[PDB]
Amino acid sequence: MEHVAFGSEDIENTLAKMDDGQLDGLAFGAIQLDGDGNILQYNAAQGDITGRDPKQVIGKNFFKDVAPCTDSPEFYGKFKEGVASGNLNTMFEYTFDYQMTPTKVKVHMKKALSGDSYWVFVKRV
Ligand X SMILES: *C(=O)/C=C\c1ccc(O)cc1
**Does position 69 bind ligand X by CB under 6 A?**
yes
**Does position 58 bind ligand X by CB under 6 A?**
no
**Does position 68 bind ligand X by CB under 6 A?**
yes
3-state secondary structure of 27: coil
Taking the alpha carbons at both ends of the chain, their separation in whole angstroms is: 20
Q: What angle do CA 2, 67, 102 make, to 5 degrees?
A: 80
**Does position 50 bind ligand X by CB under 6 A?**
yes
- Rounded CA Rg of the chain: 13
CB of 42 to ligand X, least distance (A): 8
The answer to whether residues 71 and 79 touch, using CB atoms and an 8 Å cutoff, is no
**Does position 44 bind ligand X by CB under 6 A?**
no
CB of 73 to ligand X, least distance (A): 14
Other Cβ atoms within 10 Å of 68 Cβ, number: 13
User: Of the listed pieces 4-12, 20-28, 61-69, 77-85, which binds ligand X according to CB under 6 A?
Assistant: 61-69
Pick one of 11, 66, 88, 107: the residue that binds ligand X (CB under 6 A): 66
User: Of the listed pieces 15-23, 64-72, 85-93, 109-117, which binds ligand X according to CB under 6 A?
Assistant: 64-72
**Does position 98 bind ligand X by CB under 6 A?**
yes
Pairing mode of beta strands 39-42, 29-34: antiparallel
